[PDB]
Design a protein around this ligand. Structure first.
Ligand code: 6QM
Ligand code: 6QM
Ligand code: MG
Lengths: 209, 209
C-alpha cells in the first residue's frame, strides 16, 4: 500500500537545483520549515475562531524541534492544520509549479536561494541539508499519511501507522553525512534566534540523552 | 442594510498604534497589501489545480494599482480567492487577535512597525496612509460585499451593488491629506521596485488622464 509518484518536471528541476548548486548558507532550511509550520498553525487557529471543535484533535498550537544524533535526524513537529492526502500529492499543499517558475525568474534577476520562501516552495530547501525527507501529517478531514522522497524524481505516499499525531505535520530530515551540525543544540538555538525569533508560537528545542 | 460592528479590543489597539505612533517609513503599507494580494492569488491558484471551474469567475491572476488624484484614492485590486462575509467580519480573514499580541511582544523586543506583516496583520498598515479604507470582495462561495472603516473602533459591512468584480478583493485607500505622494506614478513605481519586485503575478500600475 505504498504509492509512488513522479514529481512534476518543474519540481524535479527545483530539487536538482537545490541539491546541486553550490550555496553555503544552508541554515535557511530551518527558517523556511518553521515558517511553514507557523502558516499551518495560523490556518488551524483561524478555522477554530468559528468552529472551536476543530481543536478537539489538540488545543495546543506549537512547534517542537527534535534532534536525534543516533538516527542522524532533525524533526520539526507542529500542531497546525495538517495536510490531506490530496494536499501531500499536490506538492505538499504548495503552488510549486508556478512558485518554481517565479523563483527561477528571480534567480536570473539577481535573487539567491535564501529567497526561496518568497515563492511558496521553501519546503524544498530541506534538500540543502537532507538526503531524504519524510513528512507525516494528519488533517482533521483525513487519515494520517507519510510522504517521503530522496529526490531523484519520485516520492511515495502511504497510510501511516506510526504513532498517532492528533493533528499537524512532522518533517523528518535524514541529514547528509556532512550536515550533522544541525543536530547540535547550540547551532539550532543560534539559527532559531537569528531567523525565527519573532514566530508567534512556542518553539521547543528538545534535548538528547 | 449596513451592519456596523465593533472591532475586538486588541485590533482597535493595533489600529490606534498604527495611527498614532510616529513612524516615517509609511511606504511599507503597499508592500504589505501586495503581499496579501499575492497570498490570495496563490490560494485561488491552488484550489484551481484540482478544480479548474474555480477560475470560471476569471482566469487571469493579477494585481492592479490604480491611483485617482481627484478622489485622492489609491486602489489595489487583485483577482485572488476573495473573502466571504464571515471572513470580512473575522478581521479580513486574519488571525488578528493572536497576530496583534505577537506583534506587540515583538515591538517590545526591538522590532519596528515595518515587521507587521510577519504577524499576519499587515492589512492594518493601510492606516499609516489612509483615513478610511474600503474593501470590496467577491469569493466564489458568496455575494459581493463592501467592508469599510475610518478606524475609531467600528467597521461596516454591506452587500455591495458597485461594479461586479468577478472574483477577488479591491482595497480602496482614501488617503490622508498629507500622504498624496502615494498617488504619483514615480513614487508607486519606486516602492514596487524596492519591495515587491519578485512578486509572482503581474502588477499593473494604471495611469491617469
Ligand atoms: C508557503 C507555505 O505553503 C504551505 C502549505 C502548506 C502548509 C501546511 S498545511 N499542514 N501542514 C503544513 C506544513 C507543510 C510543511 C511543508 C512540508 C511544513 O514544513 C510544515 C507544515 O506544517 C504550510 C505552508
Ligand atoms: C497574512 C495574510 O492573511 C490574508 C488573509 C486573507 C487574504 C485574502 S483572501 N481574499 N482576499 C484577501 C485579501 C485580503 C487583503 C487584506 C484586506 C488584501 O489586501 C488583499 C487580499 O487579496 C490575504 C491575506
Ligand atoms: Mg507568508
Amino acid at each position: 500500500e505504498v504509492e509512488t509518484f513522479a514529481f512534476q518536471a518543474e519540481i524535479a528541476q527545483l530539487m536538482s537545483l537545490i541539491i546541486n548548486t553550490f550555496y553555503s548558507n544552508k541554515e535557511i532550511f530551518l527558517r523556511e520549515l518553521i515558517s511553514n509550520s507557523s502558516d499551518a498553525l495560523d490556518k488551524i487557529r483561524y478555522e477554530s475562531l468559528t468552529d472551536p471543535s476543530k481543536l478537539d484533535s489538540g488545543k495546543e498550537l506549537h512547534i517542537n524541534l527534535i534532534p536525534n544524533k543516533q538516527d542522524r535526524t532533525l524533526t520539526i513537529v507542529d500542531t497546525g492544520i495538517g495536510m490531506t492526502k490530496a494536499d501531500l500529492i499536490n506538492n505538499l499543499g504548495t503552488i510549486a509549479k508556478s512558485g518554481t517558475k517565479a523563483f527561477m525568474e528571480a534567480l536570473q534577476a539577481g535573487a539567491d536561494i535564501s529567497m526561496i520562501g518568497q515563492f511558496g516552495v521553501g519546503f524544498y530547501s530541506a534538500y540543502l541539508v537532507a538526503e531524504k525527507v519524510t513528512v507525516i501529517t494528519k488533517h482533521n478531514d483525513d487519515e494520517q499519511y507519510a510522504w517521503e522522497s530522496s529526490a531523484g524524481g519520485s516520492f511515495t505516499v502511504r497510510t501511516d501507522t506510526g504513532e498517532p499525531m492528533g493533528r499537524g505535520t512532522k518533517v523528518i530530515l535524514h541529514l547528509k553525512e556532512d550536515q550533522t551540525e544541525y543536530l547540535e543544540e547550540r547551532r539550532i538555538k543560534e539559527i532559531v534566534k537569528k531567523h525565527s525569533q519573532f514566530i508567534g508560537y512556542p518553539i521547543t528545542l528538545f534535548v538528547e540523552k
